[PDB]
Design a protein around this nucleic acid. Structure first.
Ligand code: MG
Ligand code: MG
Ligand code: MG
Ligand code: MG
Ligand code: MG
Ligand code: MG
Ligand code: MG
Ligand code: MG
Ligand code: MG
Ligand code: MG
Ligand code: MG
Ligand code: MG
Ligand code: MG
Ligand code: MG
Ligand code: MG
Ligand code: MG
Ligand code: MG
Ligand code: MG
Ligand code: MG
Ligand code: MG
Ligand code: MG
Ligand code: MG
Ligand code: MG
Ligand code: MG
Ligand code: MG
Ligand code: MG
Ligand code: MG
Ligand code: MG
Ligand code: MG
Ligand code: MG
Ligand code: MG
Ligand code: MG
Ligand code: MG
Ligand code: MG
Ligand code: MG
Ligand code: MG
Ligand code: MG
Ligand code: MG
Ligand code: MG
Ligand code: MG
Ligand code: MG
Ligand code: MG
Ligand code: MG
Ligand code: MG
Ligand code: MG
Ligand code: MG
Ligand code: MG
Ligand code: MG
Ligand code: MG
Ligand code: MG
Ligand code: MG
Ligand code: MG
Ligand code: MG
Ligand code: MG
Ligand code: MG
Ligand code: MG
Ligand code: MG
Ligand code: MG
Ligand code: MG
Ligand code: MG
Ligand code: MG
Ligand code: MG
Ligand code: MG
Ligand code: MG
Ligand code: MG
Ligand code: MG
Ligand code: MG
Ligand code: MG
Ligand code: MG
Ligand code: MG
Ligand code: MG
Ligand code: MG
Ligand code: MG
Ligand code: MG
Ligand code: MG
Ligand code: MG
Ligand code: MG
Lengths: 122, 130
RNA sequence: UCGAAGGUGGGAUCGGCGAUUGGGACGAAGUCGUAACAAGGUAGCCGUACCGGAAGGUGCGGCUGGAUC
RNA sequence: CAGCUUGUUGGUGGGGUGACGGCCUACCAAGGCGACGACGGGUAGCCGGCCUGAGAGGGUGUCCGGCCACACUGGGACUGAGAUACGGCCCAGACUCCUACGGGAGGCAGCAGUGGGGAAUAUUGCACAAUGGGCGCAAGCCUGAUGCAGCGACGCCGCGUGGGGGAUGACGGCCUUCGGGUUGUAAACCUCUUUCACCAUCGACGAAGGUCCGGGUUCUCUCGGAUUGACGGUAGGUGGAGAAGAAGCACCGGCCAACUACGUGCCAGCAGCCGCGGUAAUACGUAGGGUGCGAGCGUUGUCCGGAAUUACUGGGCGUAAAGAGCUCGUAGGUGGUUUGUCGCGUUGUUCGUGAAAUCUCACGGCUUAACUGUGAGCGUGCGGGCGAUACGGGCAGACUAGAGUACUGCAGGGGAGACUGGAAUUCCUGGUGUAGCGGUGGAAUGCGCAGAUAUCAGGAGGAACACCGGUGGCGAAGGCGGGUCUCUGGGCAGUAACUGACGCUGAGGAGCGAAAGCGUGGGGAGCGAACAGGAUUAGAUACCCUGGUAGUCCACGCCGUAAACGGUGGGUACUAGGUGUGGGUUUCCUUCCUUGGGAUCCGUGCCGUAGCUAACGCAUUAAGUACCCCGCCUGGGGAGUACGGCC
RNA sequence: AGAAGGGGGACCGGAAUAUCGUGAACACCCUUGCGGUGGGAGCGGGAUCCGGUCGCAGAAACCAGUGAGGAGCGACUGUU
């Protein structure tokens, strides 16, 4: 509207918020994974989600999510972290890759056999 | 009172919507030329110029079909004073995919889309009459 | 003469931590009240001032986004 | 980030450069840059190109190509036609190393490789066989440029992991209504082919090429004797038995193609959303079945699209987010009718340019494709010449319609100052007069008995102006009526008397601007925040009652905020009617006295046509149809809050 | 706020004979005076630039502010 006013003040695209701040440019960031514990998700879920405090090589501390049936995690551990939303936990915005430098692939895994870590057979 | 071409188009559109059989407005050479183009295109009936109290007034009589049907589907000014619209011969505007007529102001005078494309000279697209 | 580097000095600007402290968001099934939605029990809002555990209350001026004869 | 600059801007005379030039120098002027964003801060190699998108556009600059900048950091000169002079020099700093302690040497952002960081990216290979470059008369030499090879599914393309009969409805598994069906012609069994693998052989084009000889005497040419390929014994061809040597991956609730059972029972768990799991889960793990792709399939990271949720294309602003409180006006944008000129915008042709590859059409070659070659488009543009003035525009004119001025009337709580009036409340004084008054739903606090309430008369004082008074009038908005006088603003009507586009909007900027509040002095009847007592209530920091301070008032300043609302920016043109009111004018019906009806202008209400709207509703006083200008919005909180800045 | 913190300062020569600025003699007109204009002698003053010279030191001896930051109290000059 008002081409003269548009000439005086052009349009501006919406502001953007980045979603990979902790990784800051890396699809996977190598972390430390200290103090593995378990918390409770939001009200209408009533579960016990296994989480951890992992500090990346980019020197940021975030709370990640551990997928699969159980884990071998412990105090500081040689782990890889990828992005992902949990939709139940307050502010967990990253997920640890299962089948990485330290953590093992989820045993007894036969379906989808790539996520959570699973060799075919050998 | 800006863009007398727009005022003329708006008056014609309002009269056509209100089923008026007669319009009156002060006369100008550009409006007379536009009336000539409209008469040639067949969207309107006869037009004439009559001397009012001050200046001259241009008079257009409209045409209606068999029922209360309007030959003029609508009007749309194109080259507004806020932003002028200029078109060349290779990219002349198309109205209704050829079923509409756009007035083109070239060095040969006021011309329609097809006639202007025939002679290959472009200019300012005054409006779409379709 | 100019001239890199270096020294001395007052400033300029951008960050980090900080005893202590203010407000905000979310949590559970806590405590104290019922301010709004009905004329919500004293109609509700808007600007300002003052007061009080808290929501809020009062005055001044305005609106109906309420009613009345 | 609102003020930047002093060789800075210019001039003069010299100096300097290959060359103009404050490039340098001596003197003179005070200038130069800035709201079209200088100066300052953050970020960044630019482009041809690449990705996405129908396009416009949004993202990006990696292969390759063009340029630029750099060579441990910082500075400088020389040689030379030509220097960021990576493998040149001088100096300062850091680092590393040798040393006899006096002193010296060094820079992989060349190829290969090492250490370190990261989720992560490769051989210390061959050859100048071809091309380019440098040195000679050459023969020849060098070339980590280059031509290749080696590693990686890293990306594109292509081919295989077989095929012909098969209901033994293999066995089984699975589901199970115990009947059956699914896996499923795929299998076994009979058979055909050997694509790519394995083994042996031949064997390249790439070289109308370069050397030593024969015609040529050397200039030009073919001829053969010899040799020259890293690739490479490689491509490719041939010969041999054998389906024999070869598939996996993700999903199956809606988006979106794919359901049953087992275990589990808010637990294990999954998930992009919303939703499933707390005892019959097509959503969890598992089994079967299905879907889709394939030597790849899913996740993560980012961009484009869906998103018309930054809208030129292609949005809105009465109530969903959105019109500054109002007005004036700087720049700016935009503009009535008509004549002539220019041809700047506009448009046409022509010429030059717009590198190549890459994008597309059409072909040609690798068995095909990927890949590559050719012809034409692309290269949206720019410069030059030659045509037009239809529109915008420059100039020169003209007109009155816009706008403004003129004259005659009209209405008005428009505003400021000064003087002045009545009612009422309160208070004071005196008279009459005695036991209550006030207050509520009920009371009590309170007042009087020391003479109250009530009644009369007089006086003092401040505030506000009943009736008129309304649906009305005026004002840009806020607002405006007791009366009189003085000064002053604006509007409307009529004549067309005069000028002649002098108009509209208006970033910033400026002025005005309810109530509350602030400063200084005055004033204070009544009301009345705060405060106090009484009453209600569990509590009552309130609603009710009794009081009562600032304030409300005046003078001059300040503050600039309201639901400052028509929740609707200003200006103009057009788009049925019906019915009230206000100010004018106008002929007629002109006495039908009617101050009525009819015509026009300026407003103010309601109802209603078309049209618009999600609806409510708007509807000539638009939220309808168009144009010009300004302001504002991109989910809700956090928040109109923090920091900074102005007052 | 003299915030703080910096730079220069001696002598000789030249610019430089109106260089500049102070006053204004000889000599220049008229209403002749204790008059006016021009004029520039002699005599004093200050500053700057360039070149040179000396020393350990150029404000030369005497003379002549120390400065900054945080609190408490009283506003301040004053009085005891
Ligand atoms: Mg738009
Ligand atoms: Mg702290
Ligand atoms: Mg309540
Ligand atoms: Mg209330
Ligand atoms: Mg109540
Ligand atoms: Mg209430
Ligand atoms: Mg109160
Ligand atoms: Mg209030
Ligand atoms: Mg009120
Ligand atoms: Mg100079
Ligand atoms: Mg010069
Ligand atoms: Mg850079
Ligand atoms: Mg689109
Ligand atoms: Mg450098
Ligand atoms: Mg290095
Ligand atoms: Mg350097
Ligand atoms: Mg040379
Ligand atoms: Mg030279
Ligand atoms: Mg150098
Ligand atoms: Mg070199
Ligand atoms: Mg090197
Ligand atoms: Mg290298
Ligand atoms: Mg790493
Ligand atoms: Mg590492
Ligand atoms: Mg070679
Ligand atoms: Mg060669
Ligand atoms: Mg891989
Ligand atoms: Mg489906
Ligand atoms: Mg079950
Ligand atoms: Mg499942
Ligand atoms: Mg997207
Ligand atoms: Mg878009
Ligand atoms: Mg919208
Ligand atoms: Mg609302
Ligand atoms: Mg709203
Ligand atoms: Mg307003
Ligand atoms: Mg407002
Ligand atoms: Mg406001
Ligand atoms: Mg203007
Ligand atoms: Mg203008
Ligand atoms: Mg015009
Ligand atoms: Mg103009
Ligand atoms: Mg082919
Ligand atoms: Mg090209
Ligand atoms: Mg041309
Ligand atoms: Mg007029
Ligand atoms: Mg007054
Ligand atoms: Mg009194
Ligand atoms: Mg008495
Ligand atoms: Mg009395
Ligand atoms: Mg005239
Ligand atoms: Mg205006
Ligand atoms: Mg303004
Ligand atoms: Mg007030
Ligand atoms: Mg006051
Ligand atoms: Mg006072
Ligand atoms: Mg009390
Ligand atoms: Mg009260
Ligand atoms: Mg009272
Ligand atoms: Mg006060
Ligand atoms: Mg003011
Ligand atoms: Mg108001
Ligand atoms: Mg609008
Ligand atoms: Mg309007
Ligand atoms: Mg309007
Ligand atoms: Mg009316
Ligand atoms: Mg209506
Ligand atoms: Mg609307
Ligand atoms: Mg604020
Ligand atoms: Mg602040
Ligand atoms: Mg000092
Ligand atoms: Mg100080
Ligand atoms: Mg010396
Ligand atoms: Mg002193
Ligand atoms: Mg203190
Ligand atoms: Mg003292
Ligand atoms: Mg004090």
């Amino acid at each position: 509207p008002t081409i003269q006013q548009l000439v005086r003040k052009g349009r501006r695209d919406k502001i953007s918020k980045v979603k990979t701040a902790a990784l800051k440019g890396s699809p996977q960031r190598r972390g430390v994974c200290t103090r593995v514990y378990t918390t409770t998700p939001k009200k209408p879920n009533s579960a016990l989600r296994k989480v951890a405090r992992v500090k990346l090589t980019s020197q940021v501390e975030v709370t990640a999510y551990i997928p699969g049936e159980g884990h071998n995690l412990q105090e500081h551990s040689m782990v890889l972290v990828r992005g992902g939303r949990v939709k139940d936990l307050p502010g967990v915005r990253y997920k640890i890759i299962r089948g990485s430098l330290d953590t093992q692939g989820v045993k007894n895994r036969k379906q989808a056999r790539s996520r959570y870590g699973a060799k075919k057979e050998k | 009172m800006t863009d007398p071409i727009a005022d003329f188009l708006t008056r014609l559109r309002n009269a056509n919507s209100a089923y008026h059989d007669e319009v009156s407005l002060p006369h100008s050479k550009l409006k007379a030329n536009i009336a000539q183009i409209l008469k040639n295109e067949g969207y309107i009936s006869d037009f004439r110029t009559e001397d009012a109290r001050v200046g001259k007034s241009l008079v257009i009589q409209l045409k209606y079909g068999p029922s209360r049907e309007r030959s003029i589907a609508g009007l749309r000014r194109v080259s507004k004073p806020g932003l002028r619209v200029y078109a060349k011969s290779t990219n002349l505007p198309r109205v209704l995919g050829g079923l509409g007529v756009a007035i083109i102001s070239t060095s040969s005078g006021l011309l329609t889309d097809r006639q202007a494309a025939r002679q290959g000279v472009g200019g300012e697209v005054l409006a779409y009459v379709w």
